[PDB]
Amino acid sequence: MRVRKRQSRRTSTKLKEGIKKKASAHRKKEKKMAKK
Amino acid sequence: AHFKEYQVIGRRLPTESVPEPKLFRMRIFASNEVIAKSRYWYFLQKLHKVKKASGEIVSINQINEAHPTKVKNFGVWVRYDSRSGTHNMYKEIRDVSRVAAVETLYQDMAARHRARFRSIHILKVAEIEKTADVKRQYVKQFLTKDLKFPLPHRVQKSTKTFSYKRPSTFY
Amino acid sequence: VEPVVVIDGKGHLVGRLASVVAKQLLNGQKIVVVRAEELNISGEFFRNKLKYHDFLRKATAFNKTRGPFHFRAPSRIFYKALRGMVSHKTARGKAALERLKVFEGIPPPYDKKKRVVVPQALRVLRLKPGRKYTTLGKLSTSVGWKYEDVVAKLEAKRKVSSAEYYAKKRAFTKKVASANATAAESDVAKQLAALGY
Amino acid sequence: STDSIVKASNWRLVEVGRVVLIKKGQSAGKLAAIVEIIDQKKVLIDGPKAGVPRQAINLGQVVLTPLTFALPRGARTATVSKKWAAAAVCEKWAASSWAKKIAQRERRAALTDFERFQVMVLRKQKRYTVKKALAKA
Amino acid sequence: MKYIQTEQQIEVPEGVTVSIKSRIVKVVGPRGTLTKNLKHIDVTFTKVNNQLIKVAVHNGGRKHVAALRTVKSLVDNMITGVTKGYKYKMRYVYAHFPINVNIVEKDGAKFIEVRNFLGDKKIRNVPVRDGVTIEFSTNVKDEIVLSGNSVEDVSQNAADLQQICRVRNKDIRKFLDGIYVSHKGFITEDL
Amino acid sequence: MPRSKRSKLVTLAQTDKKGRENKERIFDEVREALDTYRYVWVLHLDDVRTPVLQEIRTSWAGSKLIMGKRKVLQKALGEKREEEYKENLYQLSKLCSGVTGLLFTDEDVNTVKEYFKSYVRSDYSRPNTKAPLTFTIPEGIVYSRGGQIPAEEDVPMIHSLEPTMRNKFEIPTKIKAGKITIDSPYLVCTEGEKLDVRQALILKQFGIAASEFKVKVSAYYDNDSSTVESTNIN
RNA sequence: UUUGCUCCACACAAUAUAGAUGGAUACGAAUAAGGCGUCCUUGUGGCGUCGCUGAACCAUAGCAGGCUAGCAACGGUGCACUUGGCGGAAAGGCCUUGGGUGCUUGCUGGCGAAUUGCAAUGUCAUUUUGCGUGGGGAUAAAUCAUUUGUAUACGACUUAGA
RNA sequence: AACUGGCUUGUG
RNA sequence: AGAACUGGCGAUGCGGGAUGAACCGAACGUAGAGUUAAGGUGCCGGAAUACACGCUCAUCAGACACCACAAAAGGUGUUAGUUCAUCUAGACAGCCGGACGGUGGCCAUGGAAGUCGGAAUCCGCUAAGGAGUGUGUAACAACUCACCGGCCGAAUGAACUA
RNA sequence: GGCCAGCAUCAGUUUUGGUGGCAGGAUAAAUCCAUAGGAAUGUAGCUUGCCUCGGUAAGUAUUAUAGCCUGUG
């Protein structure tokens, strides 16, 4: 047909280290909540 | 790795006015000794108030099987803590030995549940003598009279990169 | 082993064939490939066609001429994937690919010569049944290789020619087997069997 | 003539009775027989005569022979040996063309250069005879 | 659950004969013959004797075995289509404009020709497949009958034919006219 | 077959399922009936009407007519000689093959065997049967009776049912204005042929109980004699 | 052609080798199937047999391959001819006729080898070119200048010119 | 002078 | 966001991560040989198209580093489980019969009869049959379940997790 | 008496094969021998049906005209 645009599956490093820093924020928030 | 089954007892240490506590026993599956020991202490700290420092090991014994090459139907009650709360499960095997059955179990749990060795618990093995009280079907169909079946589409694993023959399977 | 190898490409898969080829080229066996209208690729027709239209829409937007050539034809497909498998920019690469010759159908002079296969690339071993495959002749004619009905005609010509040939070879083997088995039960034959021949 | 002429689709079949060759392992060119089936891909065998133990094995490590004899499941090794020698398979196998070929490759690998020159000359002699046998008739 | 062996039975009667090389079938009976390729389906056939044939699969996934039951019913449909033969009956109804319906042959083409549809001038031809015959209904008004051995050919032809008069942009509740199927029977009547 | 199954249709109806409680209940209740009553009759009734059964029950209240599922009736009767409430019951448990159905009386045998020969109703074909009449439907307006009564007083058939006539009943039925018409006459059946299910349905649709109804019996038992009796009367 | 071009012979030279150093040894279709042989009623036929690796089939001794003697056979193989076919997908080869010419390890004899000195790639194949040697063959076009103008930024393009 | 961290999208 | 501790980078190269300030490994003189770490072994690319259990077949899968953001769920794709229910004293599918009387229950209306619609929820025989799911005609009628029962004989089904 | 190499025997380092003798475990467990008991995906044998006249069906039958499981030694 017109075969349309894909998203990649490429790594795109800023999002990797953003994921890691976001992850640590999530786990920090979990520890702040987990006393309750 | 390739597995073994072990017999362990722990004899939690003599304290004064309670010497020789009650020799808590387990049958534990692993490839070697120290892995077996650590799992005994892990289950034991779960099950009652022990620590390794407050406990001590009596003996390790490899449990061989009595009549290995008897084909057996085994049925295993297990638990596992996957990502959710922990939960139970029963599974059924036609196999030769307890140890090989749990080998296949560990891999199948790994497939179907992404289940780790570390987070598996065995409760119990049992062997079923009489047929027709097995609950499952996929073993049950391997119990019928005059059984025959084929190996369709058999393929031969050559070392060479070329063949000059236009191969076939057979049938 | 053979200086010139001649693969038949029927029943085969692209990638697996391509890998074994490329390694055989980089180690030096001059290799030639035929019948590559009748190759196979895994997957269904439509997946493979979606793929290829994606490769087809890739083009250099500032001038469409000079960029990624959407070679339509089957042999050149196979060459494409292989060129991905090789370091085509350098001389080891180029003096590999000058040890490769791809054709469709079978021209001469290889029809009078021996053809082989690969085991470890074939569909019929490697794929589970109940699973689809894609004839590249169908695919490439769907995407603009306008020669498919020709090659089937020529291969049909070849096939009868080879048919008469095999009839001759068969009769010759018939006579020869009768002659040898009749010559057998001689003591020299007994001694050959004693030594394992 | 007015009957249905589908053909039997001859399989080699796994069952209690199938006699089996082994291509890789320790035995690795020896025979045995099934006693028991476990699943699609594992079977429990034993052959005492060639020497092989009883064991479970995976099927892809073995290939089947067309040969079969009757046998009961859950057998013990005395029982299968008795049935085996009653059924006379070793002669049958060794008479089969396959084992001739195995012996041929074995002997050729076991063969001396001196005997290689011998086979060369004897083959030439046979060739002389046969090529006279042809081109005349 | 990876059923190990699945299987079905098909029943050959006395009159009819069947020839099955690899996954090709021919089925021959008194009305005639048919053939069918089934190479895409990956099963096994076996005779036991001459009134019953067994289809089967080993190591079936759900898709594989559902295909097994299907292929049985396909072959049974062929068997019925020889011994009985199949017969599909339609009617061509109008409120204002009578259809002129006809059969023609263009170089041996067996086209089916409709005119005066909804007061049109348009000719519409529909091909006829091999192996199927037409008859306009004698002594029954506004009715046509098809008969054949290939059920698939018959149904495809008639389904095409009612797919031609898919009247468009117009309220179906009003334009009740069209050409449709009365019923799907066999040829025989008696049996 | 974990997914790609059929969805079975769920509703909010009032009636619920019986289960084994009613099964064992009726079992012990007939076993209560056994010693109480004296005369026992096995009743083959294939075509049955709810008002006919209620008519028979309100005819004979001193009798009790019981129907229920077959194999449990065989159970409560006892199928072996070895297991049975009383003796000489297994042999008559053998014969009771059809839709049965049973009676517990203390009255005479003669009155009932002449009763059920006297007792005759009008019912439908109930096919795998004969129907003692043929029906041609004329090539005119079609009516609820189908040519039975005069054409002035019969009412034409409703325009709802006609596609059912085209689909189920295999018949060409063409629709002029609001009544329903046909173009050729249609004979449905003949005498002396086993009626088909579509044939039975068309005479049902006309609403014709042209077939006789009379119950047959095969056998009789008495408790005090403790003996089995075999009687085929229809 | 101070004999220039070309077909073919042998002498030497260079000239290199994406890399010979016994053989690229021919059916097709299918693989939940087939092949080979045989028989018949010739077909989706029957009957037997086979695969389960080419780990094969062919070829294969002689000084890197000699000089010779025979025996058995009229078979095999090489060289150059020559008859007649076949093949167009890039055929550039495959058959086949005839004889001539050798060799024949099918088998038995006789002579020689040495000393390259305990091994040193121990050289033996093919691509390309030139000079020479001696038998043949055949005798051009293009361009620039000029001119045109359907074209023309100058080139180019298209026309004519003994 | 233009995605912190997949930003933004139709539903208080 | 703020503090406190600690470790890395800063002065510092190397292997891998396709490439790289923050990741993983790692004690730098020049050389040889050996063995390995982290990462990997179809080809690029040195290394098993290794062995083996399973699951997956995407009309742009995944090869992710992971809990993490769209996110709680939809889905008649698929495999394995849990808890419940049914049964040769006949499970489920189906085909066949019944599926009633008082009753057309009350207002309500032109018409409302189990189904335009408000509210009631009875007993009778009952194997079973509702003051009555759904098509329905202006009403009525007819048909269907939900419910039983006849033929068949075999295991099946609801919900939930993963 | 310089350059390149080769063979043998030796040493340090190290990789890869063959092969023998020992110890342990439940002094392996198993197989295998005997013995006792048990049961079936019920072997012989018995009963009924078909009959293609021997294969099913359902019963019988605990080794017999196959064998298996368990316990002990």
Swiss-Prot record, chain A:
Domain of life from the UniProt record: Eukaryota
Compartment list: Nucleus
Residue ranges, compositional bias (Basic residues): 1-13, 21-34
Region feature Disordered, mapped onto this chain: 1-36
Domains as described in the record: In contrast to other GTP-binding proteins, this family is characterized by a circular permutation of the GTPase motifs described by a G4-G1-G3 pattern.
Other remarks on this protein: Present with 7130 molecules/cell in log phase SD medium.
Protein name per Swiss-Prot or TrEMBL: Nuclear GTP-binding protein NUG1
Gene name as annotated: NUG1
Portion held of the full protein: 1 to 36 of 520
Swiss-Prot record, chain C:
Coiled-coil zones: none
One term of GO molecular function: mRNA binding
InterPro entries, alphabetized: Ribosomal_uL13, Ribosomal_uL13_CS, Ribosomal_uL13_euk/arc, Ribosomal_uL13_sf
Modifications the protein undergoes after translation, according to the UniProt entry: N-terminally acetylated by acetyltransferase NatA.
Stored Pfam families: Ribosomal_L13
Localisation per UniProt entry: Cytoplasm
Cross-link (Glycyl lysine isopeptide (Lys-Gly) (interchain with G-Cter in ubiquitin)): K175
GO cellular component, one term: cytosol
Keywords: Acetylation, Cytoplasm, Isopeptide bond, Ribonucleoprotein, Ribosomal protein, Ubl conjugation
GO biological process: cytoplasmic translation; maturation of LSU-rRNA; negative regulation of translation
NCBIfam families: L13_A_E
Family statement: Belongs to the universal ribosomal protein uL13 family.
Extra remark beyond the main annotation: Present with 43300 molecules/cell in log phase SD medium.
Quaternary structure (record): Component of the large ribosomal subunit (LSU). Mature yeast ribosomes consist of a small (40S) and a large (60S) subunit. The 40S small subunit contains 1 molecule of ribosomal RNA (18S rRNA) and 33 different proteins (encoded by 57 genes). The large 60S subunit contains 3 rRNA molecules (25S, 5.8S and 5S rRNA) and 46 different proteins (encoded by 81 genes).
Protein name: Large ribosomal subunit protein uL13A
Organism: Saccharomyces cerevisiae (strain ATCC 204508 / S288c)
UniProtKB/Swiss-Prot annotation, chain E:
Matching SUPFAM superfamilies: Ribosomal protein L6
Superkingdom to which the source organism belongs: Eukaryota
Gene3D superfamilies assigned to the protein according to its UniProt record, in alphabetical order: Ribosomal protein L6, alpha-beta domain
One GO biological process term: cytoplasmic translation
GO CC terms: cytosol; cytosolic large ribosomal subunit
Cellular localization per UniProt: Cytoplasm
Claim: Cytoplasm is one of the keywords in the record: yes
Pfam families: Ribosomal_L6
Keywords for the protein's UniProt record, in alphabetical order: Cytoplasm, Ribonucleoprotein, Ribosomal protein
Major location category of this protein: cytoplasm
Keyword Ribonucleoprotein part of the UniProt annotation: yes
GO molecular function: rRNA binding; structural constituent of ribosome
Extra remark beyond the main annotation: Present with 52400 molecules/cell in log phase SD medium. There are 2 genes for uL6 in yeast.
Subunit structure, as described in the record: Component of the large ribosomal subunit (LSU). Mature yeast ribosomes consist of a small (40S) and a large (60S) subunit. The 40S small subunit contains 1 molecule of ribosomal RNA (18S rRNA) and 33 different proteins (encoded by 57 genes). The large 60S subunit contains 3 rRNA molecules (25S, 5.8S and 5S rRNA) and 46 different proteins (encoded by 81 genes). uL6 lines the binding pocket for eukaryotic elongation factor 2 (eEF2).
Recorded family membership: Belongs to the universal ribosomal protein uL6 family.
PANTHER family: 60S RIBOSOMAL PROTEIN L9 (PTHR11655:SF16), 60S/50S RIBOSOMAL PROTEIN L6/L9 (PTHR11655)
Name of the protein: Large ribosomal subunit protein uL6A
UniProtKB/Swiss-Prot annotation, chain F:
Bilayer-spanning residue ranges: none
Keywords annotated in UniProt: Cytoplasm, Nucleus, Ribosome biogenesis
A cellular component annotation (GO) from this entry: nucleoplasm
GO molecular function: large ribosomal subunit rRNA binding
GO biological process, one term: ribosomal large subunit export from nucleus
Domain of life: Eukaryota
UniProt subcellular location: Nucleus, Nucleolus; Cytoplasm
Pfam families named in the record: Ribosomal_L10, RL10P_insert
Record CDD domains: Ribosomal_P0_like (cd05796)
Alphabetized SUPFAM superfamilies for the sequence: Ribosomal protein L10-like (SSF160369)
Sequence similarity: Belongs to the universal ribosomal protein uL10 family.
Function, as annotated: Component of the ribosome assembly machinery. Nuclear paralog of the ribosomal protein P0, it binds pre-60S subunits at an early stage of assembly in the nucleolus, and is replaced by P0 in cytoplasmic pre-60S subunits and mature 80S ribosomes.
Assembly with partners or alone: Associates with the pre-60S ribosomal particle.
Note: Present with 18200 molecules/cell in log phase SD medium.
Protein name listed in UniProt: Ribosome assembly factor MRT4
Gene from which the chain derives: MRT4
